[PDB]
Design a protein around this ligand. Structure first.
Ligand SMILES: NCCc1ccc(S(=O)(=O)F)cc1
Ligand SMILES: [Cl-]
Lengths: 437, 430
């Protein structure tokens, strides 16, 4: 009748078995079993002799940082089990950590097509929208390695959670975190394709609980990277009461309509305002809607999105992010004097407009021929190439500061006639344009 | 297959890979190579007396295109006579540049609240409908074709409706709907059937856009072009993953929008971008080139819940909305009401998550109001009849009514001046 909770399995259980559960806060719930792995039971609680169990707990400690764990929080790094400061329920009920404050202030990802044009702010949920065969995992990993909060008095941490991945992918992520030293400031949760589906379902909840704990109890800005929500959804649609039931039809369980919202609700500035939880969920377009209907991923898209584009990938460009369909709705809260730089908005606006114009002119060029294009139009056409070649394109290991990003922006903007810079205040042209300054 | 596609009248027999000249609207010629052909239309890939010099494929242009149903090649499909042209216009877009260097602006009333209210369509904009297999994007497209208008515009309004690769049953349905509602009288309708030559499918949006340019520029009209659907267009390129040149080819479609020279007309596009239900047989194309001014998102969640039209405003966006709203265009309170409904709906939807974490009875009284607001938004604002044509006033007033469910002190996005003037609890009866 109510919330799904996650319980430590201590004996075999049957479908719809009535159970009593001891919660993290010491209270008890009664509920019904939906599904189970070897170690975990999924229980749907009721409001207000049988099996008595305890909830599955995150072993919460600052010593989570530097560790690589399974989806259930068990070590994968050869290290000892986490010694907990606190044992926390994982479904979101623990801590009540979120403030009623808007997201704000800069997270530097080091990727120009995010920081420059679609800025990530602390407390935001900003999905990466992608598809099979595109390098969204590479982008996610690069952000994990590079992200920081310039000028903040609060410490920064990363929670990286990968779901449904292959053995070789897991080995790769582990090696990357270890060799780069990104592991020092990260908690890494790795769920394998062949791990139990219930473990996959618990994975983002373990990750979000760790993030909330570090943000709220330790005053950290925490960035949570979740790759891939689509993979999570493929497990969900075959778990418990959803098994062989069809979305929108009789028999499809109500919790399937709100499950994704239990994940996307969990982001924001935390109480005290010294910390925050920011999410970058990867949403890969599944390709199999007809055979594998999943919960609508649109619910996760309320504060913008970063779009990975096959066009740019096929051009040989990494990261292949198309800024034009990309958006950060909270960008203005994270940029400008004292955050990035005063000319940030102006430079972003002008690059966006110039790139959009240049891309339209690729069409016009095809319609009339290169020789028929005006000199002014040719400059914008060329600007779109410069934008893709110099601004969009950056190394896998290239961590650009926002100043680096804005400088590249100004350099490519010099290709346009100064009189065509309609989105940039004259004050910023005089102060920052390379032909001046 | 590298160069851009140009369409040429079949006036003489041609062969594959034959090198040809194409005569352009200004008397110059471009050189190309024959890629493919139907009986009447040659597809040339362009580069950079002795050889074939071809004429561009032409639209027979006249105001009498209005009220007609044509094929993708412009031939009558309505039993009527062939169009008698005032002009023969190159459909490749090259003989005439009607577009002004002006930003899109001013209101197009679709009559659909989740467009007009929260992500307003403006004249000259390209605003795709982003949808997927099994969703009612075609119903939405037809509803917009029936309902759209430009309130208070001195310029007359027309619709160009182009459907690509459709079944005979869909064709009959579209024709019937245009005819019986009278929507046909202000429209030029281009219907390309699935079994029509693939060449005619790729010519279809170019015929449509040429018709819209002619009406907009030569007759001072605001023209709304509805193109359904681009995924099917992309598949025709495939049967002629996707070819590399597709991205440039799409730009030849999406460049063709905006206010026209003189600013008494415009070409606005609503392309339908539908994601295939089966990746294996119908690969997912990168149509993101078309998405530069926002998107209207058709959502499975809302469709599953039995709501029409199933538009989720939160991922939807109109980048140019501010240029189409307010005093003299819609109403002064538009931006505030939109901002507040968006914020309230987003908060309510997050609170659906919280309910599924802590249980409904654990929510605060305040949070419960926002939770209930999300239900009201979906049931009263999102939901509307297939033939329910809402004025912007109607949609703003629905908005105000549902906003009364929230505590007045929680209306952070609304200027006190608009609360005093328009909030049902304060507004004076006049
Ligand atoms: N197989 C279709 C290709 C084609 C079809 C027709 C011609 S033509 O007769 O009009 F010259 C040329 C090439
Ligand atoms: Cl859903």
């Amino acid at each position: 009748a109510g919330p799904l909770i996650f319980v430590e399995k201590t004996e075999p259980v049957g479908y719809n078995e009535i159970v009593n559960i001891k919660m993290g806060d010491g209270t008890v719930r009664r509920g019904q079993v939906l599904d189970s792995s070897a170690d975990i039971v999924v229980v749907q609680v009721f409001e207000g002799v049988i099996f008595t169990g305890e909830t599955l707990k995150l072993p919460a400690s600052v010593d989570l940082l530097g560790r690589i764990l399974s989806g259930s929080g068990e070590p994968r790094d050869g290290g000892p089990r986490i010694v907990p400061d606190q044992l926390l329920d994982i479904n979101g009920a623990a801590m009540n950590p979120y403030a009623r404050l808007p997201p704000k202030d800069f997270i530097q990802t080091g990727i120009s097509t995010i920081d420059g044009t679609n800025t990530l702010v602390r407390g935001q949920k900003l999905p990466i929208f992608s598809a099979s065969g595109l390098p969204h995992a590479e982008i996610a990993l690069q952000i994990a390695r590079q992200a920081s909060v310039p000028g903040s008095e609060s410490a920064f941490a990363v929670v990286f959670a990968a779901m449904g991945i292959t053995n070789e992918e897991a080995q790769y992520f582990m090696s990357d975190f270890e060799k780069t030293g990104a592991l020092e400031r990260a908690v890494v949760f790795l769920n394998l394709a062949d791990d139990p589906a219930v473990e996959r379902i618990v994975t983002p909840r373990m990750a979000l609980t760790a993030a909330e704990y570090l943000a709220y109890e330790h005053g950290m800005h925490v960035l949570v990277i979740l790759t891939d929500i689509t993979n999570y959804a493929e497990a969900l649609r075959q778990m418990g009461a959803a098994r062989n039931e069809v979305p929108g039809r009789r028999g499809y369980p109500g919790y399937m309509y709100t499950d994704l919202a239990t994940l996307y609700e969990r982001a924001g500035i935390v109480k005290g305002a010294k910390g925050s939880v920011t999410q970058i969920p990867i949403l890969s377009m599944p390709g199999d809607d007809i055979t594998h209907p999943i919960p609508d991923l649109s619910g996760y898209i309320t504060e913008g999105q970063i779009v990975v584009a096959r066009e740019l990938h096929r051009k040989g460009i990494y990261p292949p992010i198309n800024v034009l369909p990309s958006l950060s709705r909270l960008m203005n809260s994270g940029i400008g004097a004292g955050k990035t730089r005063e000319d940030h908005k102006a430079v972003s606006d002008q690059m966006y407009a110039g790139y959009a114009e240049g891309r339209d002119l690729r069409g016009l060029v095809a319609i009339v021929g290169k020789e028929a294009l005006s000199e002014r139009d040719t400059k914008f056409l060329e600007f779109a190439d410069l934008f893709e070649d110099k601004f969009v394109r950056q190394g896998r290991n290239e961590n650009r500061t926002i100043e680096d990003t804005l400088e590249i922006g100004w350099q490519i903007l010099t290709h346009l006639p100064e009189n065509q810079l309609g989105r940039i205040d004259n004050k910023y042209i005089q102060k920052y344009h390379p032909a001046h300054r």
